[PDB]
Amino acid sequence: DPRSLYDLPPYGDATLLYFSDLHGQAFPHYFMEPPNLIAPKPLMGRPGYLTGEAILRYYGVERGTPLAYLLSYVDFVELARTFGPIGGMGALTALIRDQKARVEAEGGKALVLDGGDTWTNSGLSLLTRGEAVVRWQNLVGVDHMVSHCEWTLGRERVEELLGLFRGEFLSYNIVDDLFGDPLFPAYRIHRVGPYALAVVGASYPYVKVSHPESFTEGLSFALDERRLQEAVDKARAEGANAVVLLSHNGMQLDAALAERIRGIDLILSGHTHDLTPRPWRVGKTWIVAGSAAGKALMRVDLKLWKGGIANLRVRVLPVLAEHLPKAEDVEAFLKAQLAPHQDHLFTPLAVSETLLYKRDTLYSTWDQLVGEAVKAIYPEVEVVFSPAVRWGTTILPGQAITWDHLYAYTGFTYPELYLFYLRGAQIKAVLEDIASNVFTSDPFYQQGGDVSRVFGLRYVLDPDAPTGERVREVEVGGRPLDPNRRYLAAAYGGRLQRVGEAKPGYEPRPIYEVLAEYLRSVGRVRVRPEPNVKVIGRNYRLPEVTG
């Protein structure tokens, strides 16, 4: 194949250069799709839960193609050396500029839309408090954006960064706590020749329960179906023909809103970190996923009519630095921004012998390394609870782990590792609480990422089982779980420390400081995929860690 994916013929009146969940990934790295996306029986086989060979057959993607490397985990190690690294702010800007140049030469309108989760969770982000990410958006020319993890910086910082942001921030759900007045506009109407296109902004509704309440004090994020319908109806009344929803509510929740809310013709879903080469049809609305770490740019060419979208062309463009031109302005910007932090962020700490992936529903190799790192420094710890966050990176066999990779994996604004005692009954109740939230038949009752990976214990999981029966046969350290016994637990980037009794003498310190202390001392890491979970009625897939 001559990788001619970018060279596309003219289509429609409008074009939306959409990308989501970049998470401040400034440099070209690797990001493997989850090997398993376990869903309950009524939600099996639908987009957002497809993995491996199943996702390739569904969209008709051939094995060994550039799209196959981005969509599936199958032959990832083999294709990562072949197609090179994905993402990077320089490679992403170069692709957006190239595609915007094509659309404008044809005679159409091109809109650059960001799908939230951009300003935080990286090396470049933490050192500038999300400022360098906002300044990059002005360089590329982002028209609109949404939020979720942007609020982790604090209310004062977000308001400060929005003033620097040249584009227009859109949100309908972000309202005041005491009254309920929207601080940001719900939508924006753009003139696309004889037609008018409206872009409705939707932010994550469970923002207050995801990160500490102090960051979003005096704000309401809650999902309002009445306010969403009113925003769509007001847009069409003003003169808009088609309605496009820039959302971060989650692909599953957006699909539930597609059958409940009228007027929406297209939904640009984020938060779930999914990929869609073909648009998902739910009722009378097309759903396009926004990917993760900026590995893909979704070009949505729209043909518009008097009552919405007539037809559409969805093309997932792979952001490959090895096959894309150089955006020297962004490269000079990133070099100047991280000039005194070059010897910190890029100096190798340890060389990995096996593949280190983050994305999965129950178990990942990177989270086992975190569990091994905590247990090596602190041998008193019996269980290491790791957050199942969708954002991160992937370490290839032979590739060295640097400080930038640690900030890409554990780049929380609250990275404090807490050592606290938990009762056996609490550990079982917590695992059941996440399972009832992740494996829910109704997409409305879904919150956060995946099921939290706990190193030290082994358990049998049944997703189709009722609440309080999903988690069974729990065994801590090769011995069955005693509900009265006090087990020492270690957790970071959560709220588990609130219900647990804190360890005396211990002071909470950042997780990346603990990880670097382990990596520098060992020199080399050999983490083999050993799943501590047994799924009932589902086949748990395992990727190739060698190559």
Partner: protein, 83 residues
């Protein structure tokens, strides 16, 4: 002792209107913890409302010249007037 804010949600003839009532009071159920003493608000002049102990701090009241009165456990009447 009490702070009350009232606002209408221009009303068109025939169509149904909304009344937004909000007051600055720290509502406590008593169960939350040292133990915090229970202090909560437990009326329109057409419609009477009596909330229980489980009420959030600084709550919102929705109803479909206006004078409103709110009484609590201690005895602090909350009055607000709107045209």
């Amino acid at each position: 002792p009490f702070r009350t804010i009232a606002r209408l949600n221009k009303p068109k003839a025939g169509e149904e209107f909304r009344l937004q009532v909000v007051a600055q009071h720290p509502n406590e159920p008593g169960t939350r913890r040292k133990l915090i003493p229970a202090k909560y608000i437990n009326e329109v002049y057409v419609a009477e409302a009596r909330p229980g102990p489980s009420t959030s701090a600084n709550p919102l009241y929705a109803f479909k010249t206006f004078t409103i009165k709110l009484k609590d456990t201690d005895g602090d009447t909350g009055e607000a007037s709107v045209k």
